């Protein structure tokens, strides 16, 4: 039987969260780059502002990824339960 | 993702684990009850997401072929050796690869659902390979998952 | 400056969840092993029961681990925000 | 975990980002407001956990030395190249390593906070290294994180 083995691992709301956050990672990556490497005179207030927006976007994408992993393991729990009947 | 006949029948029994009122359909409400019985706490949105993933016709609930069709995509299993080792490591107070027979009995008779002191005797008889009153839990777990 | 770099990654309620679930992984690992390898006559009803309890315990530990990762990234978000002031 | 003088001063400015009412203390309530302003949604228990981790004296709130003492443990940073590449990959419709200049403009002028068509012109001028109207986003991200 399956003994101690378990299912091997690996929405629209989350999908919207991903596209908006990802676009903002692109936005703020670009604007930090521009303001730190393509200017004659770095404006730190500008860099700080875009660093705040960059970290928020990156952490939004991490949040989505973590939620996906959680959802995947919740579904795998249900598949594992169903598989007990294979015994 | 191709399922046998015998597995189709066993998964019908499985469906009854989920379809609590046996009305032929699994709802978010039934799924919540089941997930909580398994010691998890999915949110409303997570329950709806789990249904929406296997909800072919978009009617809000899961039927048997959505349920079966879906098992087919996830029949692959993998060994649990490392996860089991990590569970033992929780009780490895000094992080030395060992848990004493005494500490194992103490854990198993007080935490979780528990074993009787006698069930623990049988477990320790197998676990303490060297008869030194110490359990090398990496080795024991490897033995049990071999 | 820090440019595009971010903080490098890696409770009592969760602690109790961990010890109880981990003890149950040990419990059910043992009982599945016994009932599949140390008996003359496998009782599948017994194996199914302990497989259900095993998967629930394993998935409880996964749930705790995921929550820890989420908490860690929430704290790292706050550290990242504070670090914008270093610019 | 040793902090300089200048960094201690800059982190005082940081504390004001969190201490919304400037009463000298950060509460779970202020932390919720801040986390939500950053587009996250921590639960009550998560907020209490975040406080309890840096809450040295157990009075339920974070003060400046709990806040500072705590930054010291996490000053290490790491590069974000791979995470940034993965953000671009979201818009790589055909999974071929490329996003066209046209599709990039379309994304950047419609999704998220957005760039002006003119800001996009500057971004594409840098991103389209080969002048072929296509962005190899792995290369562009490597350039920006160099
Ligand atoms: C077939 C097992 N299963 C999932 O994978 N997701 C589910 C959602 C509801 C019920 C069972 C589920
Ligand atoms: C010093 C940054 N920080 C954490 O690491 N956890 C926090 C909880 C509340 C406020 C700031 C926090
Ligand atoms: Ca039903
Ligand atoms: Ca359906
Ligand atoms: Ca305050
Ligand atoms: Ca405190």
């Amino acid at each position: 039987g399956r003994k101690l083995e378990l299912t091997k691992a690996e929405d629209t709301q989350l999908t919207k969260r991903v596209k908006n956050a990802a676009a903002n990672v692109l936005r703020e990556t670009w604007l930090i780059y521009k303001n730190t490497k393509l200017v004659k005179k770095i404006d730190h207030a500008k860099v700080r502002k875009h660093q705040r927006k960059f970290l928020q976007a990156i952490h939004q994408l991490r949040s989505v990824k973590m939620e996906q992993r959680k959802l995947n393991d919740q579904a795998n729990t249900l598949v594992d339960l169903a598989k007990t009947q294979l015994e | 993702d191709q399922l046998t006949e015998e597995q189709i029948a066993e998964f019908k029994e499985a469906f009854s684990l989920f379809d609590k009122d046996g009305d032929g359909t699994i709802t978010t409400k039934e799924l919540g009850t089941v997930m909580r019985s398994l010691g998890q706490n999915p949110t409303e949105a997570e329950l709806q997401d789990m249904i929406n993933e296997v909800d072919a016709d978009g009617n809000g609930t899961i039927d048997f072929p959505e349920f079966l069709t879906m098992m087919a995509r996830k029949m692959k299993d993998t060994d649990s050796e490392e996860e089991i080792r990590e569970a033992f490591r929780v009780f490895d107070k000094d992080g030395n690869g060992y848990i004493s027979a005494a500490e194992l009995r103490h854990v198993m008779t007080n935490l979780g659902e528990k074993l009787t002191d006698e069930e623990v005797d049988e477990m320790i008889r197998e676990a303490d390979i060297d008869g030194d009153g110490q359990v090398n839990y990496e080795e024991f777990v490897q033995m049990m998952t071999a």
Side-chain angles (χ1 to χ4, degrees), chain A residues 1-9 11-87, chain B residues 3-146:
Chain A
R2 291 172 62 253
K3 296 173 266 188
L4 303 165
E5 302 202 345
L6 294 168
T7 298
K8 185 170 173 174
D11 189 48
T12 33
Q13 169 79 231
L14 272 35
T15 293
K16 179 87 157 195
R17 285 185 188 184
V18 175
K19 303 292 215 176
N20 280 324
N24 284 341
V25 170
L26 271 50
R27 181 188 197 268
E28 309 299 336
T29 293
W30 163 248
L31 292 171
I32 290 171
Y33 179 71
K34 176 188 177 176
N35 279 285
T36 59
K37 311 214 203 161
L38 303 178
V39 284
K40 181 172 184 305
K41 59 321 194 176
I42 296 175
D43 178 344
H44 294 90
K46 286 192 177 182
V47 174
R48 280 192 279 106
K49 172 176 174 181
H50 298 299
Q51 282 185 330
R52 167 174 51 82
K53 290 177 177 174
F54 171 73
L55 73 92
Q56 82 183 355
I58 287 283
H59 285 283
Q60 284 157 11
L61 289 182
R62 290 178 189 178
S63 288
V64 172
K65 186 181 164 177
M66 287 187 284
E67 180 69 15
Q68 280 179 296
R69 285 178 44 36
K70 180 182 183 186
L71 287 161
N72 285 344
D73 193 65
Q74 294 173 328
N76 288 340
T77 302
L78 304 176
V79 173
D80 284 332
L81 180 55
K83 287 176 172 169
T84 60
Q85 292 308 133
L86 301 176
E87 177 66 24
Chain B
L3 301 173
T4 78
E5 163 174 286
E6 181 180 319
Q7 299 179 322
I8 260 68
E10 274 150 2
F11 285 147
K12 178 55 158 54
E13 296 174 347
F15 194 78
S16 291
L17 303 179
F18 299 88
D19 187 9
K20 296 264 283 203
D21 68 8
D23 82 331
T25 204
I26 311 167
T27 56
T28 53
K29 187 185 174 67
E30 292 174 317
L31 188 55
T33 294
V34 173
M35 288 287 276
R36 281 184 308 275
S37 79
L38 296 169
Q40 289 185 52
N41 291 275
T43 63
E44 178 64 13
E46 289 164 348
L47 293 169
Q48 294 183 2
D49 288 338
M50 276 179 269
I51 288 169
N52 291 358
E53 286 274 11
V54 345
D55 175 23
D57 56 2
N59 76 345
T61 62
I62 291 167
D63 58 21
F64 189 69
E66 282 171 342
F67 178 92
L68 263 185
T69 290
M70 167 53 54
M71 293 294 297
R73 298 184 172 164
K74 283 198 156 161
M75 292 289 301
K76 185 61 173 174
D77 294 316
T78 190
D79 80 271
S80 300
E81 185 196 335
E82 210 283 324
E83 278 192 288
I84 294 166
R85 185 170 56 233
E86 284 281 347
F88 277 87
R89 187 167 291 117
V90 168
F91 303 110
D92 179 3
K93 285 183 290 196
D94 297 323
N96 51 24
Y98 282 94
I99 302 160
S100 69
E103 184 58 24
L104 185 56
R105 178 179 301 279
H106 176 72
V107 171
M108 296 315 305
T109 61
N110 290 285
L111 297 62
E113 186 157 2
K114 294 176 264 190
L115 295 177
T116 60
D117 285 279
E118 298 63 57
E119 275 167 342
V120 168
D121 286 341
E122 307 181 349
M123 180 182 184
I124 286 169
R125 175 168 52 173
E126 302 300 320
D128 179 16
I129 289 151
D130 301 289
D132 71 339
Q134 300 287 344
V135 176
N136 181 319
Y137 56 86
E138 175 173 44
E139 282 194 348
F140 181 39
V141 171
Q142 283 178 352
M143 182 173 83
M144 291 194 283
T145 58

